[PDB]
Design a protein around this nucleic acid. Structure first.
Ligand SMILES: [Mg+2]
Ligand SMILES: [Mg+2]
Ligand SMILES: [Mg+2]
Ligand SMILES: [Mg+2]
Ligand SMILES: [Mg+2]
Ligand SMILES: [Mg+2]
Ligand SMILES: [Mg+2]
Ligand SMILES: [Mg+2]
Ligand SMILES: [Mg+2]
Ligand SMILES: [Mg+2]
Ligand SMILES: [Mg+2]
Ligand SMILES: [Mg+2]
Ligand SMILES: [Mg+2]
Ligand SMILES: [Mg+2]
Ligand SMILES: [Mg+2]
Ligand SMILES: [Mg+2]
Ligand SMILES: [Mg+2]
Ligand SMILES: [Mg+2]
Ligand SMILES: [Mg+2]
Ligand SMILES: [Mg+2]
Ligand SMILES: [Mg+2]
Ligand SMILES: [Mg+2]
Ligand SMILES: [Mg+2]
Ligand SMILES: [Mg+2]
Ligand SMILES: [Mg+2]
Ligand SMILES: [Mg+2]
Ligand SMILES: [Mg+2]
Ligand SMILES: [Mg+2]
Ligand SMILES: [Mg+2]
Ligand SMILES: [Mg+2]
Ligand SMILES: [Mg+2]
Ligand SMILES: [Mg+2]
Lengths: 236, 115, 157
RNA sequence: AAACCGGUUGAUCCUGCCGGACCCGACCGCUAUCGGGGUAGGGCUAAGCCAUGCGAGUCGCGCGCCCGGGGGCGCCCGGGAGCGGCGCACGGCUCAGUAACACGUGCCUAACCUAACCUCGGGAGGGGGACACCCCCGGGAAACUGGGGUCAAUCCCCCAUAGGGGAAGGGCGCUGGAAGGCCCCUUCCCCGAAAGGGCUGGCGGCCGAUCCGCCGCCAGUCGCCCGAGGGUGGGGGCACGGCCCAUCAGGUAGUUGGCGGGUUAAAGGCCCGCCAAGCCGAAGACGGGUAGGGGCGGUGAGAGCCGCGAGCCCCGAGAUGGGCACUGAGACAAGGGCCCAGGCCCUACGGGGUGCAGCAGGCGCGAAUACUCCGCAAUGCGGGCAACCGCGACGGGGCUACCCCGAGUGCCGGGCGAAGAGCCCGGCUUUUGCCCGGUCUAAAAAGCCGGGAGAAUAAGCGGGGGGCAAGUCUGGUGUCAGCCGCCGCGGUAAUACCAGCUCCGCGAGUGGUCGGGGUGUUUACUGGGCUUAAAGCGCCCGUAGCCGGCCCGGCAAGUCGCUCCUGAAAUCCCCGGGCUCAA
């Protein structure tokens, strides 16, 4: 399967005309094609550690790159929102976070919050045994007992332990929390949740965010709760 | 004549090299030899000439000024598996010529077999 | 189903009626003073002049709020190129800008107007053979439109 | 630059056409130095026929065998023919079919499938078999292909359990706008997994130099099976939008719908059994013609007109015409299969291949067209743990008046010449052309830097009666020849023809014929006209349509304002920056 350079996502940090007629195509990983960047692009463009595609594949082939605690040796692995990228031989850590300019950015983070990942609940399914399965914004799943999974509704953000496969902290979606817009024109904006026009489809509800006193509006689908007045993990 | 100065140096631990940038200032004089740039850098950085590879020397229009992109490798064995063959053939003198040459004999092979 | 291809950039200054006597007389004067090669170079100067004037025309038609972010930067950019003299004139003052102001910015003209050559055609020959250094670099295109700050760096070999 | 100018008259004001001037596209004529940027080139012509070559492989970390070199612990390495896994449904080409859910925009699948990959939960127990390469023989012109023997698997098969499907009854519960869904309970029927395989290290045991392994365990790593979700790809559905003709007015009979079924991965007259008469149409059915749709492109000051809507990107369809299937997650498959039609090719006459709308290339047609070149280095893709391999995709150059950009074909002074061209003299420079070195490039080439000689190597095309800039100068012809977009010349004194001289426009270009736009308020929404110039139906009743009095209250459809999700990229406008400026 190919990806023409014209059909590449608009926000990717690559020149549109100059270059080849091809772009590296992500291999159906834990994100969406429109909202993910392949690992070889990050190693060559965003970190500039490789000057060619073979050099980027060589760096990835050694297992030097760790993505969310798992060494990825696939150069077409997709990276997306709230993912933790760690470079082993240099010890630097980044969290791909919603950016006001690049639309998605590699921000350095402290080593303590490297195992933590904030995940937005995209939905729940009832599985065998009566347990509940949670689906997150990057396709990741987590099966829970029925009573604990009853109190986690959709669009709630949960801080997930990659190290323990557990839920550190559950952040319900209520009016008055700190949210970051994760898609759309108003990307990168972090503000208080203070207004909602509940539509018939909840995913299409109009939501307003405030930062004293710049007010931006989006739909309810495009905002992730990052907690109260203090963001739980460094995003900006 | 030939003014050399390290314009920049980026430390790359992943590929085990320091991609160095050099500024060559040769007023009223020919473009500097790529061997001459490698000798200056090896003497400048104190490393052997075998660990230093000149990628491209680009000369500005209308004046004797050049910029060269150079890769200095920690160990020679890894350098010969990371740099392309034509870079070694340009830089390593004769051995890269053989490495390019020995590559070609393996290329006629597997192509007559495909025949 | 249409593929874009580049078009001539000197068409805006080209007259649609070339066979006018007074038009032929005025243009023939301009080629003589500034030593141009053909009418294409002369029209290319006018095409630049039409850009500066048509842009200033549209900025006048824009609202006061819309004009505000672009008004001063437009005049400032005109000043730095050396076309205008005051970067603080009223916007309607730019409308009467004249094509000779663009022709003075040509690198060939500056070599002659700086006394660096015997004649304007000699100064074109100086740039062509590569004896004119602009800030230390050889600039061999006689139609180079030098900006204001680079003007003081023009030397001979 | 929101532009006019020529021509119907004895003269005049109109109407109204035709011409001139401009841009772009195709073809062609004369002429042609250099460089830079660019996704230019059998499209506008036959989806016409094709010689030849190249155009999808990869993996020994799935598998046994064979060969060569090396070494003792248990093997190392290289190679061969193969089995096997994955891929070859991507990529490349072209424009016949198509006026259609094809395409575009905005939404759905609560009516669906999806190998590779990601995450969570669970699993990997028992037992068998065959076929290649090879060996002993072949058959056949070749294509291909037969028999016996023999070693394996991540090859194929069985058994178990998990799981899965159906029908039926119940439910707290989940999702979601809404359950024919998910989860739990009960009954029966039915189908029904897996490779603990490879590698590494450690341990121990069996075994033997005719072995160089096999077994149990542990850890690391790459894998395998099931359930759920995601991802990607795909099947299907909906609302609306975009050609011409009435010298095409009625069309339809599985046609329109209902009920019950079959089939499908899945809804559906998709198909079938029954029932009804419905469905479409002048708000234009039906029929005919033309055309792949879009992003977009040319032109104009704009509204607009046109498609050069060829080239680049997205979707569609096709692979000589017409059909039908295998395998597979996916094809009814451009370099796979089968049949018919229509060609052609080799043959030992018994057979066997093939259709270039792949990249070069040939013939043909036509007004009209490139190299049977180089590389997998860049951009990617398939395969691999990796290393790396392959790729006519892609990149590079060649040819080609393809588009745009920057330059040269000298500069200074002097005399003759006319203030021109030109000639000569004196001084200067080397862009450029030529030679060389470094740099660049996969390698070349070109570019760039530097060096040598040297003014030295380099201008045409169309015109001079008006439009329209340029000769009432001269020779020749004498209403002949010739010119002429229009007006108009030439029949002896030609500023219009053939020539000389001279001048004009543009210039590496400049012309000829076409097509589009402007021209053109000659298509008129902006913005025409209809007494007499073309133009009011002979008159009237009226259907659709369009247009419609006043006041009060309600809604908020149109309409207006703000915001959001969108309207791919490229293209367009503005601003900043980087190539010497420019493109
Ligand atoms: Mg007009
Ligand atoms: Mg008359
Ligand atoms: Mg006309
Ligand atoms: Mg053709
Ligand atoms: Mg393996
Ligand atoms: Mg083999
Ligand atoms: Mg195979
Ligand atoms: Mg395709
Ligand atoms: Mg047998
Ligand atoms: Mg298997
Ligand atoms: Mg189920
Ligand atoms: Mg079984
Ligand atoms: Mg087995
Ligand atoms: Mg059904
Ligand atoms: Mg039917
Ligand atoms: Mg083509
Ligand atoms: Mg057929
Ligand atoms: Mg076929
Ligand atoms: Mg054919
Ligand atoms: Mg490659
Ligand atoms: Mg030019
Ligand atoms: Mg004289
Ligand atoms: Mg060269
Ligand atoms: Mg002539
Ligand atoms: Mg004459
Ligand atoms: Mg005149
Ligand atoms: Mg004439
Ligand atoms: Mg009229
Ligand atoms: Mg009447
Ligand atoms: Mg009549
Ligand atoms: Mg009536
Ligand atoms: Mg309304």
């Amino acid at each position: 399967v190919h990806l023409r350079k014209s059909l590449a996502p608009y926000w990717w940090p690559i020149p549109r005309k100059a270059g080849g007629v091809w772009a590296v195509r992500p291999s159906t990983g834990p994100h969406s094609l429109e909202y993910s960047l392949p690992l070889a692009v990050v190693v060559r463009d965003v970190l500039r550690y490789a000057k060619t595609l073979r050099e980027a594949r060589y760096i990835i082939s050694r297992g030097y790159i760790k993505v969310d605690g798992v060494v990825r040796k696939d150069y077409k692995f997709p990276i997306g929102l709230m993912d933790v990228v760690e470079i082993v031989p240099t010890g630097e850590i980044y969290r791909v976070v919603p950016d006001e300019a690049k639309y998605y950015d590699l921000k350095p983070i402290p080593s303590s919050e490297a195992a933590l990942k904030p995940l937005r609940v995209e939905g729940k399914t009832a599985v065998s045994g009566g347990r509940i399965q949670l689906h997150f914004h990057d396709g990741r799943n987590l099966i829970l007992p029925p009573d604990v999974g009853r109190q986690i509704k959709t669009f709630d953000t949960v801080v997930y332990d990659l190290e323990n496969k557990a839920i550190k902290t559950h952040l319900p979606l209520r009016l008055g929390q700190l949210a970051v817009v994760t898609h759309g024109g108003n990307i990168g904006f972090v503000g208080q949740f203070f207004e909602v026009v509940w539509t018939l489809k909840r995913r299409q509800s109009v939501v307003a965010l405030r930062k004293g006193e710049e007010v931006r509006r989006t739909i309810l689908d495009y905002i992730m709760v990052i907690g109260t007045e203090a963001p739980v993990v460094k995003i900006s | 004549e030939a003014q050399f100065n390290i314009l920049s140096l980026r430390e790359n631990k992943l590929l085990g090299r320091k991609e160095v940038l050099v500024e060559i200032l040769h007023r009223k004089s020919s473009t500097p030899t790529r061997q001459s740039v490698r000798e200056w850098l090896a003497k400048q950085l104190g490393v052997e000439v075998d660990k230093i590879f000149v990628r491209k020397i680009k000369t500005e229009y209308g004046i004797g000024k050049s910029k060269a992109e150079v890769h200095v490798y920690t160990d020679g064995a890894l350098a010969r598996v990371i740099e392309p063959l034509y870079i070694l053939a340009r830089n390593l003198g004769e051995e890269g010529k053989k490495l390019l040459e020995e590559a070609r004999k393996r290329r006629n092979e597997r192509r007559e077999k495909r025949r | 189903g249409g593929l874009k291809k580049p078009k001539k950039k000197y068409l805006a200054g080209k007259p649609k009626k070339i066979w006018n006597k007074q038009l032929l007389l005025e243009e023939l004067q301009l080629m003589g003073e500034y030593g141009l090669r053909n009418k294409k170079e002369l029209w290319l100067a006018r095409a630049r002049l039409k850009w500066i004037v048509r842009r200033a025309r549209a900025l006048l038609s824009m609202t006061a709020e819309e004009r505000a972010p672009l008004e001063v930067p437009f005049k400032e950019k005109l000043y730095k190129m050396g076309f205008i003299e005051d970067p603080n004139v009223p916007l309607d003052r730019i409308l009467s800008l004249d094509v000779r102001a663009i022709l003075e910015r040509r690198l060939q003209t500056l070599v002659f107007r700086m006394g660096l050559a015997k004649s304007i055609h000699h100064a074109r020959q100086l740039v062509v053979h590569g004896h004119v250094l602009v800030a230390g670099r050889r600039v061999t295109s006689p139609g180079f439109l030098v900006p204001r700050e680079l003007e003081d760096k023009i030397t001979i070999e």
